Design a protein around this ligand. Structure first.
Ligand SMILES: O=C(Cn1cccn1)NC1CCCCC1
Lengths: 237, 300
């Protein structure tokens, strides 16, 4: 059934599972035409497929050419997502295939179920959590590889960097979702927090800066403050 | 015109014959139903006064034998049986006719309702859905489950309707996932019509039989089957024109006949709103949409 606050620790047990977020698959800019009508122009997108225990991110880049000559693109985007996830599962060795796939949006349930009919033992689940994975394109290195792609491409990254050497999966996921929630609520401010101190760098093979344990506590506090601020700025409180 | 006699009526019961019904009192001078139209299947059904639980009854075709009803005080129900001695049966029925102990199948001549509800229903197909090969007639009741229901428990007592499942490998061609799920024409036309049913007449016959079991016995799995078979047609973009026209007539008479007071439990809001207003065939069911809107505007 649905994944929610009550069964939250199941994310970090030893049964392989993947979150799938389709928010950023079909991306457009809306603009005016010479005649004064409105049109869309697609840009490259990505499927965000994440193992929350290990941090393994399977970033399937969706190149604008996949939309060429197609109709009802927002509907097609859900089926293309399901096709690519099913292809990913079939490409993995049996002992690496997931036992559950959790979709962040309920409209992905039927597309993924139909594409995974060959895998009756893989459970397709919704979630009641409001996860901030849409903000994945606020991570500079992820956005860069998506926008530079000239063809369909899969790029594999650990979204936790080396954090699991020092903290548990539960704590790593909590840090990730706090960072992404901040970037989603006020990207400019969040990015300022993360880079204000130029002496803390991002390793070539990492996504986030190389904070010490003590610096992560300060950073995490600054992100919470940002989120509460924006919540006040928004609602006036 | 044929006759289904009764040895007696020892317990108070409401007896149905097709869309008709009458009350018989405990030990009332009752010997049966005469003047039953030849050419159609029929159903004779029962609801005991003392336990409205379990409606039950028998599908039969008087061309296939001489049938009668006799109460069994051990199993506690009215049982259909075949009389193999034709002379004995004719003589007993003739005496009953002479003593006017039989009700007459009360068919108004203008009325085509029963033909319209059973147009494609054949006894031979009924007997493959309801497996009991030693009898020529078929028992159905309120509680019998379908093969599909069992999969999700006594197989000898199941309704073996054709399994329809929109999220199954049978329904979805590898590589045509989105196409086949959003337009079920290949499942309808290749898998079901060409493959399993062979022709639309047998498909309509099972659809009509499922509705009638839902209506007369409140058989929930039959209602599920009826709606699935409607939805499979309406969710196909490509359907022979003759099937759509016939479907509209079939559903019209089903909706017309349904007791107004059972609409809440025998009609699936989702299926009907999808079929009449969202599906590919939203504009192809004019008679059915008109009777539904005037008779059950609440559901919609
Ligand atoms: O009574 C029987 C069969 N039977 C059971 C014991 C002995 N003879 N059959 C009649 C004939 C037709 C009408 C009512 C049923």
């Amino acid at each position: 059934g649905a994944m929610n606050s009550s069964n939250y620790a199941e994310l970090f047990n030893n049964d392989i599972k993947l979150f799938v977020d389709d928010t950023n698959v079909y991306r457009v800019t809306v603009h005016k035409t010479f005649e004064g009508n409105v049109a869309t122009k697609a840009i490259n997108g990505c499927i965000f497929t994440l193992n929350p225990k290990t941090g393994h991110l399977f970033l399937k880049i969706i190149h604008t050419s996949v939309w060429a000559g197609q109709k009802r693109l927002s509907q097609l985007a859900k089926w293309k997502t399901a096709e690519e996830v099913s292809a990913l599962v079939r490409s993995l060795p049996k002992e690496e295939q997931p036992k559950q796939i959790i979709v962040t949006r309920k409209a992905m349930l039927d597309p993924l179920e139909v594409h995974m009919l060959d895998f009756p033992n893989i459970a397709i689940r919704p979630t009641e959590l409001r996860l901030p994975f849409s903000a994945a394109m606020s991570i500079d290195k992820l956005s860069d590889v998506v926008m530079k792609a000239t063809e369909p491409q899969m790029v594999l990254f650990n979204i936790y960097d080396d954090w699991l050497d020092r903290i548990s999966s539960y704590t790593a996921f909590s840090r990730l979702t706090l960072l992404l929630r901040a970037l989603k609520t006020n990207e400019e401010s969040a990015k300022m927090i993360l880079l204000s101190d130029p002496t803390i760098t991002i390793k070539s093979y990492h996504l986030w800066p190389s904070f010490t344990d003590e610096q992560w506590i300060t950073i995490e506090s600054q992100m919470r403050d940002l989120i509460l601020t924006e919540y006040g700025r928004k609602y006036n409180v | 015109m044929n006759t289904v006699p009764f040895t007696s009526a020892p317990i108070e019961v409401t007896i149905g014959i097709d869309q008709y019904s009458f009350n018989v009192k405990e030990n009332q001078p009752f010997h049966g139903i005469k003047d039953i139209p030849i050419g159609h299947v029929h159903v004779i059904h029962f609801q005991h006064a003392d336990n409205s639980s379990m409606r039950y009854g028998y599908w039969f075709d008087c061309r296939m034998g001489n049938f009668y009803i006799q109460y069994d005080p051990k199993d506690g129900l009215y049982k259909m049986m075949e009389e193999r001695d034709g002379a004995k049966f004719e003589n007993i029925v003739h005496n009953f006719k002479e003593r006017q102990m039989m009700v007459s199948y009360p068919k108004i001549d203008e009325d085509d309702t029963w033909y319209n509800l059973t147009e494609f229903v054949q006894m031979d197909k009924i007997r493959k859905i309801v497996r009991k090969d030693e009898n020529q007639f078929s028992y159905v009741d309120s509680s019998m489950t379908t093969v599909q229901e069992n999969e999700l428990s006594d197989p000898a007592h199941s309704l073996n309707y054709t399994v329809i499942n929109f999220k199954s490998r049978e329904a979805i061609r590898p590589g045509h996932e989105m196409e086949d799920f959003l337009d079920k024409s290949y499942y309808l036309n290749t898998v079901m019509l060409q493959g399993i049913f062979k022709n639309s007449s047998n498909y309509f016959g099972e659809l009509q039989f499922a509705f009638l079991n839902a209506m007369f016995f409140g058989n929930y799995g039959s209602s599920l089957q009826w709606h699935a078979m409607i939805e499979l047609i309406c969710s196909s973009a490509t359907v022979p024109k003759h099937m759509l026209d016939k479907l509209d007539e079939i559903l019209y008479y089903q909706i017309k006949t349904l007791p107004e007071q059972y609409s809440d439990i025998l009609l699936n809001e989702r299926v009907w709103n999808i079929c009449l207003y969202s599906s590919f065939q939203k504009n192809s069911l004019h008679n059915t949409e008109k009777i539904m809107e005037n008779k059950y505007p609440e559901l919609l």
